[PDB]
Amino acid sequence: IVEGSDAEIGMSPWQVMLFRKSPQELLCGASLISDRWVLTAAHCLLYPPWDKNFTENDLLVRIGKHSRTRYERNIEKISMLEKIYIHPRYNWRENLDRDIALMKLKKPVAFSDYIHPVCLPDRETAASLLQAGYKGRVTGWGNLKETGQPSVLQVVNLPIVERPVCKDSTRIRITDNMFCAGYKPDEGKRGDACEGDSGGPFVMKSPFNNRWYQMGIVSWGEGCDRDGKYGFYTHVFRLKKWIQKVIDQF
């Protein structure tokens, strides 16, 4: 995150850390949606062009974190996976359209003050919130500038931008399973996710049931916090039925 802030303890109970066993690097971010499932960006696992192709036992999932680096000894939970599900039509060759995957943790995790699932939106919910001008919140441990690494979880609240503006800011083909958010070079504030944030959650707070809903997944952006450039997130509600379908189908 760029021009963010540090997250208060327990601010993002559902924020997950995708981590490789060897070397011991933070691959990407993620989110807890059940006691058995983590939701991420497909391109965190699978990205042929950079020879990326991770497996079940190449990664570990660290829930409950706050410090980026430290093994938070009594607070955090480290879980083994059991099965990565990429969308069937993730488009890694063209524009990363349908950048969404599901993880089945080896065993359920237990909730705490610091570990807690985020809701998945419903049509009416996606339908009253996913409106330009409305702010959402991104969380992560990624670079602090395009180009350096945070001590603690970072946070930044961004506006949703009308699709015409997102479209006219890139030469990349923008699909329906995508939304963009950020400030325009003029609104006077800034911030945006960056490398290391992908897989991470874009969440909104319901003004109706005071609940938190994940509306997007940090996807891509040309750079991090460049003027007249916005971040692109996977539209979780549009990929909804697929998501249900795998949890139930399995």
Partner: peptide, 5 residues
């Protein structure tokens, strides 16, 4: 995540 193709 860093597009420009």
């Amino acid at each position: 995540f860093x597009k420009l193709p």
